[PDB]
Design a protein around this ligand. Structure first.
Ligand code: FE
Length: 165
């Protein structure tokens, strides 16, 4: 099922997700609905927080052919290095983009869809996407890195778009 993605302003986007206690059938079903939602909404990443499920679950697919499913359950950042930035967008901040500072490379550890631990080193777009999704799980959005004024304008623009429905 395609789930509803929350849009700012919405306080549920600021909630801190709790760790997943056990990767069971129910968690797998959430992972699956999150990928369905992410693809339907044309995204490359989605955090559970964005679909009002406050557990540490992230789905990502940054591949050209949309066939490389990465699942990050209970991810932990182990190392990071460098600095970089691209104009990021967000499914919860429709049609707004802004350059945000990010580490260029990251190394994380997480559980996959089977509950198996794995480590992943990433750079480029994937490193940026991982940081953006991990920020969502602790209630942080990319606009938070921008000036107060820019944040105001972003919020006002999204509210307008959503009013036009
Ligand atoms: Fe996002």
């Amino acid at each position: 099922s395609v789930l509803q993605v929350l849009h700012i302003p919405d306080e549920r986007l600021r909630k801190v997700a709790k760790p997943v206690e056990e990767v069971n059938a129910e968690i797998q079903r959430i992972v699956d609905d999150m990928f369905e939602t992410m693809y339907a909404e044309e995204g490359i990443g989605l955090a559970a927080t964005q679909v009002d499920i406050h557990q540490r679950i992230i789905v990502i697919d940054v591949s050209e052919n949309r066939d490389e499913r990465l699942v990050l359950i209970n991810p932990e950042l182990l190392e990071k290095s460098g600095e970089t930035g691209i104009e990021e967008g967000c499914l919860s901040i429709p049609e707004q983009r802004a350059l945000v500072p990010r580490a260029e490379k990251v190394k994380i550890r997480a559980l996959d869809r089977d509950g198996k631990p794995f480590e992943l080193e990433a750079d480029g777009l994937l490193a940026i996407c991982i940081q953006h999704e991990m920020d969502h799980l602790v209630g942080k959005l990319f606009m938070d890195y921008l000036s107060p004024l820019k944040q105001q304008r972003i919020r006002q623009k999204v509210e307008k778009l959503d009013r036009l429905k």
